[PDB]
């Protein structure tokens, strides 16, 4: 049985436990290509099912995702409950290495679900984003305001009847918005943002944004302060919203790949991989081995690039401005190899449905060998220059520390989750893209996630990525760079240029789009900054019916208030430098 085969997952023990607890008629099991059991639960039993999953012998401890879907235009809904809208809850059990997708069906008039925040605190921002983009009200939410769009925004953009394209610009709207930007400091009310007891009169309100002098993006944090002590803080995000999901509903399966590049713009091919993997799951494509090793090579190269930039920016935020120049020279070496392979520096747009855009250029191994010889001495130099310095250690150790429980309840993944002592990497637990054929280690922490522990874990991850790159250079199969499937978009170019059936396939795939049959697919990968995921719903057309991108920087920014509570502003700056987030990843 192939990995893309449609499975109902009725042999999962979670289905049997749910049947024994709630009854055989309490839910509907859906057969998908997501790889996880999809269970449609009634709305009135949602909190009961969540509590039952939370109190399992090997419980589902992390709310991985929570969002909505507009099901009004979905023609192929066979074996599904009648739904105008739906809300899905993706929960991960690390102990079982399993996950379950609960789904709640809502009518068009009764668009309200009970809040999930009493079970999982990340449901705060997840439900705020669901309300902002779909208009679904969550009863019991502490403060259900818009998180992506401004508060004075009419309509909900991810609904099907909302126009995707840009409206006409008016200087009047900009000028009045400048007026509210002017009186926002004067007319600030903490009750709007969920804060309480604002201005006792021992607290002051501090706004860091909107523009920070850093490469992680532009955003605001409002802080309740007693002197230099932070008591309450909520981040103001949505300043980097690009409508990537709404764009996914109006681009074909092939023409959306450059938009998948700019989700985490320090990731590139790392961001391209889960999307093309989920599309290949929809298409029923098993890629050959050379495609797997090429994609692994480019993903590890871009992971090293992102980790180098993150370590450099953390060192610069500490105060040492020297190693960022040398590490950007190293990034220039990586960019030289990436320019040679894909033709571009930062957003290659090189992964394809079924393979990659071109074969590897003649001489890639030379550039890879020079880069692999160049890296370790520079890494040791950066280590001895800044990451073994006592001033950097005093600035970074013990700042914004959290344990395994806090990382599990807030959906923190990547360096922080492994620094809390939990060994969970997608490249080993749920392997993808032929990662089982590479010998590499997963670094883990002692059990407490400091800034320093996360930075050293990222350094060890860079070392392991260098090991993977060495294995890619030494052992590469000789064969096709595209699959032997009719849905490989585009087909190989020489056969397009001299065969007429291949020309027909190329013509209809680049113009109208490749036709993915109606199914739901899900791919979860380990990104450069945590765990990334693409959830793609196809209605049988040439475009995505629903593109849902889960990014870890959302969860990290939501964990920001729970970890910095009771600390200083400089601790907040060091924490922001030690998260490895981009605002495009948060806001997408």
């Amino acid at each position: 049985e192939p990995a893309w085969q449609t499975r109902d997952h009725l042999d999962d023990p979670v289905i049997g436990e749910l049947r024994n607890r709630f009854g055989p008629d309490a839910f509907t099991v859906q057969a998908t290509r997501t790889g996880v059991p999809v269970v449609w639960i009634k709305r009135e039993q949602l909190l009961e099912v969540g509590d039952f999953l939370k109190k399992l012998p090997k419980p589902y401890v992390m709310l991985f995702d929570l969002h909505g879907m507009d099901e009004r235009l979905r023609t192929h809904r066979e074996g599904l409950p009648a739904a105008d809208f739906s809300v899905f809850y993706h929960l991960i059990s690390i102990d079982r290495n399993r996950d379950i997708m609960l789904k709640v069906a809502l009518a068009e008039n009764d668009l309200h679900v009970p809040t999930f925040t009493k079970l999982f605190p990340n449901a705060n921002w997840y439900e705020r984003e669901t309300w902002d983009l779909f208009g679904i009200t969550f009863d019991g939410h502490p403060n259900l305001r818009r998180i992506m769009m401004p508060q004075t925004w009419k309509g909900h953009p991810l609904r099907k009847d909302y126009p995707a394209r840009a409206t006409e610009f008016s200087p009047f709207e900009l000028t009045k918005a400048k007026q509210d930007l002017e009186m926002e400091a004067l007319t600030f009310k903490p009750e709007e943002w969920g804060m309480k007891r604002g201005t006792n009169e021992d607290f002051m309100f501090l706004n860091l944004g909107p523009n920070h002098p850093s490469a992680h993006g532009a955003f605001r944090i409002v802080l309740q302060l007693d002197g230099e002590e932070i008591v309450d803080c909520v981040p103001d995000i949505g300043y980097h919203h690009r409508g990537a999901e709404k764009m996914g509903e109006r681009q074909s399966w092939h023409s959306y790949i450059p938009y998948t590049d700019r989700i985490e713009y320090l990731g590139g091919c790392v961001n391209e991989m889960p999307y093309v993997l989920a599309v290949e799951k929809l298409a029923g494509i098993t890629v050959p081995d050379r495609v797997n090793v090429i994609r692994v090579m480019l993903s590890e190269l871009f992971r090293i690039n992102s980790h180098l930039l993150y370590i450099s920016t953390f060192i610069q935020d500490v105060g040492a401005m020297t190693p960022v120049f040398f590490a950007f020279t190293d990034r220039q070496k990586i960019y030289d190899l990436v320019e040679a392979i894909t033709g571009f520096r930062m957003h290659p747009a090189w992964f394809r449905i079924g393979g990659v855009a071109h074969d590897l250029p003649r001489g890639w191994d030379r550039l890879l060998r020079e880069f692999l010889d160049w890296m370790p001495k520079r890494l040791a130099s950066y280590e001895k220059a800044a990451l073994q310095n006592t001033i950097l250690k005093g600035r970074s150790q013990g700042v914004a520390a959290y344990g395994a429980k806090e990382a599990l309840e807030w959906g923190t993944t990547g360096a922080g989750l492994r620094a809390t002592g939990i060994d969970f990497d997608v490249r080993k637990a749920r392997p993808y893209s032929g990662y089982e054929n590479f010998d590499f280690e997963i670094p883990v922490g002692g059990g407490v996630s400091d800034c320093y522990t996360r930075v050293m874990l990222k350094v060890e991850e860079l070392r392991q990525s260098l090991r993977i790159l060495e294995q890619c250079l030494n052992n590469m199969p000789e064969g096709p760079f595209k699959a032997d499937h009719p849905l490989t978009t585009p087909p190989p170019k020489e056969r397009t240029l001299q065969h007429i059936e291949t020309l027909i396939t190329h013509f209809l795939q680049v113009s109208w789009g490749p036709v993915m049959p109606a199914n739901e697919s899900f791919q979860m990968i380990e990104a450069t900054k945590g765990i990334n995921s693409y959830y793609l719903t196809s209605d049988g057309s040439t475009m995505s019916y629903r593109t849902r991108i889960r990014t870890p920087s959302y969860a990290h920014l939501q964990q920001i208030p729970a970890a910095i509570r009771g600390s200083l502003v400089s601790d907040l700056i060091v924490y922001l430098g030690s998260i490895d987030f981009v605002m495009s990843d948060v806001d997408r």
Partner: protein, 198 residues
């Protein structure tokens, strides 16, 4: 050929104030401090230009003031989001004359690939732009080439020397476009290296 801002006029340039104008323009163009404004991935390539492998410091554009008062050039490098557009306009208003604008990337040029509900389709909708860079992202040397283009744009524009003597309007030269200037050599290209090699 020049354009007024206080109108298409001619060149108004004794000889002493002419040399004063060339010296003032030389000092302005040889010392341009960009404003550190991070929007999106185009700012990542901007700070890649800022590092040691490209050396934007050679052009005297490396001081990178964090306050808009001390900066002369605004490099809008990133997407012009609707929430961030009043911030961009306020930061542009906080800058002082003379001020120039470089749009870096297709997002700042026209909105780029993000013709979406929450993106302003170009920064020229609300602030004037002096130099445009196509690319997504433009490479750092393209940003330095745009800096040179702005340098020869400044080098022949005319501005008042003092606020009490002379015409207070600002002259901007209607320069020949780079497309028509480079068409003589771009069309003559016949062969390129095949994409199967390094």
């Amino acid at each position: 050929d020049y354009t007024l801002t206080r109108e298409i006029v001619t060149d108004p340039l004794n000889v002493f104030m002419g040399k004063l104008n060339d010296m003032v323009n030389w000092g302005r163009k040889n010392s341009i401090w960009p404003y550190n404004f991070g929007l999106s991935c185009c700012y990542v390539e901007m700070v890649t230009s800022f590092t040691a492998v490209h050396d934007v410091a050679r052009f005297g554009a490396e001081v990178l003031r964090a306050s808009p008062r001390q900066a002369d050039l605004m490099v809008v490098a990133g997407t012009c989001f609707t929430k961030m557009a009043p911030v961009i306009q306020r930061l542009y208003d906080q800058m002082l004359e003379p001020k120039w604008v470089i749009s870096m990337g297709a997002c700042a040029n026209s909105g780029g690939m993000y013709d979406i509900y929450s993106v302003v389709q170009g920064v020229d909708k609300f602030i004037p732009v002096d130099v445009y860079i196509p690319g997504c992202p433009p490479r750092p040397e393209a940003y330095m080439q745009a800096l040179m283009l702005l340098q020869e744009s400044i080098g022949k524009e005319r501005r008042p020397l003092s606020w009490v003597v002379g015409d207070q309007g600002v002259y901007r030269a209607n320069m020949q476009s780079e497309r028509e200037r480079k068409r003589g050599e771009r069309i003559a290209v016949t062969n390129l290296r095949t994409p199967d090699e390094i």
